Amino acid sequence: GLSDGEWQQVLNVWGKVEADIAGHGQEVLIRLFTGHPETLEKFDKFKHLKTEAEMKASEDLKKHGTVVLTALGGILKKKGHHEAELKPLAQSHATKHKIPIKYLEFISDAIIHVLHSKHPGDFGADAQGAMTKALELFRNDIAAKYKELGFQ
Ligand code: HEM
C-alpha cells in the first residue's frame, strides 16, 4: 500500500529507466545472474552464458531485459491496480517457468542496486523507500497467487 506521494516518486524514478529501458534491463539481469548464478539455470536461452562479458555482449539478453522492464513498468504505472497485468505473470512464472518467490526478491534488490549504480547521488532516500515498497507490493501479490497454486 503506497501513498500518492510515494507512487509519484516511483513513477519519477521510473522516468529514469524509460530513458534507457534496454540499458537498465540489461544491467538488472546481469546483476541478478552474477549475484545469484542459480537463477541463470532457469533460462534455457541464457544458460550458455558463462562469463559476464558474454552477458554484456548478448543482444538477446538486452532484448529480454526490455521485455521484463516493459512489463514491470506497465504494472508500476497501474499504481497497485495491477491484477489483470500481474495474474498471467504469476501464472507463467509459477507453472511454466517455475520461479520461486526468493528469486523475485533477488531481482527486486538488483533493481535497487542498478538504480544507485546508474544514478549515484540521484536516487535519494525517499526515492529508494518508495521503489522498495512498490517492488514489495508486486512481490507480495505474486506470492499470493503462488500460494493459491501451491507453488514453492
Ligand atoms: C520484475 C520481475 C519480472 C518480470 C516483470 C518478468 C516478466 C517476464 C515476461 C513479461 C516474460 C515473457 C512472458 C511470460 O513468459 O510470462 C518473462 C519470461 C521469463 N521469465 Fe520473467 N519476469 C520477472 C522476473 C523473473 C525472474 C526473477 C526469473 C528467474 C530467476 C524469471 C524467469 C523467466 C523465464 C525463464 C522466462 C522465459 C524466458 C524465455 O525462455 O523466453 N523472471 N518474464
Please write down the long-range contacts of 140-147, taking CB distance under 8 Å and 24 or more positions apart: 141/82, 141/83, 141/86, 141/90, 142/86, 142/89, 142/90, 142/93, 142/101, 142/104, 143/101, 145/86, 145/87, 145/90, 145/91, 145/94, 146/90, 146/94, 146/101
Look at the block and give the residue holding cell 501451491.
150
CA 104 to chain CA centroid, nearest Å: 7
Q: Which fold has domain 1-152?
A: Globin-like (1.10.490)
> Entry resolution in angstroms?
1.8
State the distance from the centre of ligand 1 to the C-alpha of 12, rounded, in angstroms.
24
Q: Cα dihedral angle (117, 66, 84, 130), rounded to 10 degrees?
A: 10
Q: Is the CB of 43 under 6 A from ligand 1?
A: yes
Do 128 and 120 meet the contact criterion of CB atoms below 8 Å apart? no
Give the domain ranges of the chain: 1-152
43 CA to middle of ligand 1, Å? 9
User: Does the CA dihedral 81-4-76-40 come out positive or negative?
Assistant: negative
For ligand 1, the distance from its centroid to the CA atom of residue 67, given in whole angstroms, is 8
Using an 8 Å Cβ cutoff, are 92 and 15 in contact?
no
Number of Cβ within 10 Å of residue 63's Cβ equals 13
Q: Among 42, 93, 106, 139, name the best residue to mutate to test ligand 1's pocket (greatest count of ligand atoms within 8 A of Cβ).
A: 93
CA separation, residue 56 to residues 22, 23, 34, 138, 140 (Å) = 12, 10, 11, 27, 31
116 is in an annotated binding site: no
Residue in the structure block whose three cell numbers are 503462488:
146
64 assigned binding-site residue: yes
User: Rounded distance, CA 130 to CA 93, Å?
Assistant: 25
Residue carrying the nine cell digits 550458455 = 48
Q: Is 110 in the pocket of ligand 1 (CB under 6 A)?
A: no
Q: Which burial class, exposed, middle or buried, applies to 93 when counting CB atoms under 10 A from its CB (0-12, 13-18, 19+)?
A: buried
Question: CB of 112 within 8 A of CB of 131?
Answer: yes
Give the C-alpha separation, 21 to 148, whole Å: 32
